[PDB]
């Protein structure tokens, strides 16, 4: 009669999976809408739920990587945040590692977001006056003409450069929001959200 505790542990693993998918959808939607405090509170919930899980499918792992990517991007201007065991890695550099690791299609939007994160990883350093740090970020990350324009900007110490204006933080955020909209379309059919939406719809 010890099988009952096994069947309970299995059911809690099924419920945690549904809770994880739901909290990713909620986290993605909060990032898209600019709801900063809801993103902060939902990220805390997703991390806690994840610590209570032992087995993860490939889809659940991809889902977690997307949440980690959005968390780092949000923290992109927070140079005091240490997301990696190596304490020199800045938040935008950390988001770049995850963006190159996710098992996803490498379409034009993928490469545009990647290139925007690389320009901004340097620019944010420039903006805070950490010129030597921008040079170090440049070396860890690094097209050949694209590469030489950035090195010229770091050496010239011109933090407020027109190149950065052209491929702005806002530009990087809007492109990332377009991608999040495709993830939101894919996850809107998860079990928790679907059953919650039906309850709301039945009271209308």
Ligand X SMILES: COc1cc(COc2ccc(S(=O)(=O)O)c3ccccc23)cc(OC)c1
From 35-43, 55-63, 99-107, 131-139, give the range in contact with a copy of itself by CB under 8 A.
35-43
From the list 3-11, 39-47, 84-92, 171-179, the region that binds ligand X by CB under 6 A is 39-47
**Shortest spacing between CB 55 and a copy of itself, in angstroms:** 14
Establish if 79 lies at the interface with Ca ion (CB under 5 A): yes
DSSP-H helix ranges across 34-130: 36-51, 58-74, 91-101, 108-127
CB of 97 to Ca ion, least distance (A): 17
- 19 lines the binding site for a copy of itself (CB under 8 A): yes
State which of residues 34, 36, 41, 181 lies at the interface with a copy of itself (CB under 8 A): 41
Residues 6+ apart with CB under 8 A from 69: 95, 98, 99, 102
63: contact with a copy of itself by CB under 8 A:
no
- The total of other beta-carbon atoms located within 10 Å of residue 195's CB is 11
Q: Which of 15, 59, 61, 152 binds a copy of itself (CB under 8 A)?
A: 15
* DSSP state at residue 87: T
Least Å distance between CB 104 and ligand X? 15
- 142-157 b/e with 16+ CB inside 10 Å = b? eeeeeeeebeebbeee
- CA neighbor of 96 nearest in space, from 77, 75, 71, 69: 69
Cα angle, residue 68 at apex, residues 180 and 150 outer, rounded to 5°: 80
Q: Which is nearer to a copy of itself, 52 or 100 (CB)?
A: 52
Inter-residue contact 38 to 14 (CB < 8 Å): no
Can residue 172 be called a binding residue for ligand X (CB under 6 A)? no
CB contact set of 16 (below 8 Å; sequence gap of 6+) = 49, 52, 53
Residue from the set 16, 50, 141, 151 that interacts with ligand X by CB under 6 A: 50
Residues that bind a copy of itself (CB under 8 A): 5, 7-8, 10-12, 14-15, 18-19, 22, 26, 29, 33, 38, 41-42, 44-45, 47-49, 51-52, 191-193, 195-197, 199-201
């Amino acid at each position: 009669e010890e099988e009952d505790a096994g069947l309970v542990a299995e059911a809690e693993a099924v419920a945690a999976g549904w809770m994880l998918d739901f909290l990713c959808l909620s986290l993605c939607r909060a990032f898209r809408d600019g709801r900063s405090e809801d993103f902060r509170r939902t990220r805390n919930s997703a991390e806690a739920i994840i610590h209570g899980l032992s087995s993860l499918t490939a889809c659940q792992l991809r889902t977690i990587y997307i949440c980690q990517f959005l968390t780092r991007i949000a923290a992109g201007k927070t140079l005091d945040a240490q997301f990696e065991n190596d304490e020199r890695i800045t938040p935008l550099e950390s988001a770049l590692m995850i963006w190159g690791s996710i098992e996803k299609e490498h379409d034009k939007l993928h490469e545009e977001i990647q290139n925007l994160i690389k320009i901004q990883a340097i620019a944010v350093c420039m903006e805070n006056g950490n010129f030597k740090e921008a040079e170090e970020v440049f070396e860890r990350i690094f097209h050949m003409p694209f590469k030489s324009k950035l090195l010229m900007i770091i050496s010239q110490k011109d933090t407020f450069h027109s190149f950065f204006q052209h491929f702005s933080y806002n530009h990087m955020m809007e492109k990332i929001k377009s991608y999040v909209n495709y993830v939101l379309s894919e996850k809107s059919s998860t079990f928790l959200m679907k059953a919650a939406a039906k309850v709301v719809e039945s009271k209308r």
